């Protein structure tokens, strides 16, 4: 179910810029859309391996929930980008409430809010909108 999304997210989270450039080519992303996803990747790279591992735990437990392209997963991503830090972390808490996961949740969410402008936030969503409405998805 929606393989092309999870390949882009995995390419963002894993922190390798070259493998992300490959993903962005595969999904015909524009130069502003590329810029915005690389700023998201910087947050995983700056906050280390466990940011990938604990956010992978989060994305996994949402995707295998009762609620589940899953609208719960779509909702998680929009909150991560456009919601407030308390909104995102409280939403993550309903799926998994380990102190270390909520700690990691807030560290990433603060990073992207500090690092991305509103233009970058809008572009990440427009690139996501393409992915969600693709026939591959």
């Amino acid at each position: 179910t929606c393989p092309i999304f999870y390949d882009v997210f995995f390419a963002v989270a894993n922190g390798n810029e070259l493998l992300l450039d490959l993903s962005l080519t595969k999904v015909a992303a524009t130069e502003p859309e590329r810029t915005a996803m690389k700023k998201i990747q910087d947050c995983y790279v700056e906050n280390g391996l466990i940011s990938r591992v604990l956010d992978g735990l989060v994305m996994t437990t949402i995707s295998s929930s009762k609620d589940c392209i899953c609208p719960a997963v779509k909702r998680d991503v929009d909150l991560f980008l456009t919601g407030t830090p308390d909104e995102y972390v409280e939403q993550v808490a309903q799926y998994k409430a380990l102190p270390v996961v909520l700690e990691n949740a807030r560290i990433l969410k603060n990073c992207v809010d500090a690092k991305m402008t509103e233009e970058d936030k809008e572009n990440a969503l427009s690139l996501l909108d393409k992915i969600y409405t693709s026939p591959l998805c």
Partner: antibody
Amino acid sequence: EVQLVESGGGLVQPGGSLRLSCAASGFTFSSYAMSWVRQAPGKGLEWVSAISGRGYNADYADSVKGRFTISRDNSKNTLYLQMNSLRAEDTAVYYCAKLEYFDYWGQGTLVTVSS
Amino acid sequence: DIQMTQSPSTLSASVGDRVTITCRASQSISSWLAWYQQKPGKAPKLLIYKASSLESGVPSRFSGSGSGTDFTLTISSLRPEDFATYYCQQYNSYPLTFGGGTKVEIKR
């Protein structure tokens, strides 16, 4: 247009060094991954190295790992390939190429390795 | 490391004939395969990307098809310009890998 122009190739002895250059223009260099592809006399194409948009990551062919270093100067729109400990096997035309599937190539630059 | 097996390495044809070049990957590469044409003393030119998408300017007698592990480049009605060497290349993952090449030659 989108032009890619290689330089720096020539004759080298086995064990020695070469720095290839590729001046790019006609597109925003820093948004895209660049590769180097090569071709020995009367043989096929062979991908040698790639580097990401801002240069934080690179990958290499096993035969060339540790010897070659790919790099870029995004302010000058130039791609580089420092080739060290060169071997007879490395004798080839070296092309720089844009993206991961090669829409635009340069005209190549020939590298010959011999005693 | 994904190995690309291109077949045949050689074929000779005439003007008007159909030409089919198969190319196969040792593991799945979805639709992430490209096709090139190379003439003597020149850089390759892209024909197909994404398995079947035609690059702009390329004539429509060229077509591609395939998914997963098995891919095909067909020329419908061969012209004199089309006698060349042809290459497949996967961009599913690094390292990027090419097929061995197929030489299309003039039958006599």
